[PDB]
Amino acid sequence: SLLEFGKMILEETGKLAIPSYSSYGCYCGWGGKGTPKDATDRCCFVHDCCYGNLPDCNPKSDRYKYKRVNGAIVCEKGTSCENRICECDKAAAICFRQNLNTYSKKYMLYPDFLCKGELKC
């Protein structure tokens, strides 16, 4: 679920998902079009694609379980949708951690008109 993803993001990065990642660049929190602005925005682009691989799942609301094996995120077995959603979220949280070194506050509340053109998954 979106709330669980937000908690995962905070655990991983020390940033609150809202507002650090809820309106960032062209793809974080409301992705759709444009060239991603930086590596963090590319995490969101890929995460959006990942959810796109699951048209008959409901990633905003469906809850999954996971645990930590010494820092590592381990998705625990639920329904097929839950497992796949968890793997998408895990990847994005890791990606955000890997790209904290270039996170830029200038991309928070990034305006829609600067995000043009479709980029295929």
Binding site: G31, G32, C49, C50, Y51, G52, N53, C57, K60
Partner: peptide, 4 residues
């Protein structure tokens, strides 16, 4: 719901 996927992202697009």
């Amino acid at each position: 719901v996927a992202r697009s």
